[PDB]
Amino acid sequence: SLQEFLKTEPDGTLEVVAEQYNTTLLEVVRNLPSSTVVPGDKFDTVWDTVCEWGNVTTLVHTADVILEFSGELPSGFHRHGYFNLRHGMSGHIKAENCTHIALIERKFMGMDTASILFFNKEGSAMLKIFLGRDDHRQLLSEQVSAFHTLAASLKE
Template identity: 50%
Template sequence: MDLLTLKQKLGEEQPMVLEDFASQHKVTLEQILQTLGCPMISGSLFDRIWHEITEWSNVTLIVHTTDGIWEWGGKLPTGTYRHGFFNLRSKEGLSGHIRFENCAKIAFLKRQFMGAETASVIFLNHQGQAMCKIFVGRDSHRQLLNEQLQHFEQMQHYTTVEGK
């Protein structure tokens, strides 16, 4: 599907779950994000972005598979590199192992979802699909946390040392 047709379909259908829309129309999540004009940076900045988000207060991490949408909320754990994985270090809550080398791009998506503004950092693999998404946290009035949102905006402009 060409980008013009994809943009038209996105406008007409206004999908709630972008992965479902991508699957239905046989495109990648990355193609949808590009069509939406979503800023993206190199996946080589995985470590820097992940580390900076660990400094934020509560966030929501989502992993979307064909069989479910898994959500976790809390303070993101730090990690270390070993045996080809980025290993999350947490004694409680979220733990696991990320194949960090699979991260090709990191996208920054702001959009309305179910009547509320959302902002998420999306780690994309080489196939253009989401490895995981991390959403900016909310205050007690369900508003995006301003400090996190400002940092989210700044991270979109990071570049690698080589300027890629």
């Protein structure tokens, strides 16, 4: 049982858990009891709040490349059917295809991780944002409180 297995707190990529159960990441990130999932709307709310935090890691994963961009989230701007970004990272995102957004915080063998997932209609992540960490090793406490404030605010 998916939901039952998730309550186990298993370490490892949520993608594999999705593969095993032969389902979508969104589905997995739906059986995690503490995950905060909201609909495509809020994209700006989420992506405007995050631009406020400090440096974060944006991640794009394809069958051939895994690219990470460490830094401040760039401000948005909708037009021509795209969300267009304004330092190092830029580009355009098909906000319109984002059906769900999940804020998930969990452990990796005891080590906290926190991320924002933007899902499309197929239940796959089109983009992921991970909270940055301090030189020490832990997630930036200021960001983590901001993350929980947003998750609370979204359910509010």
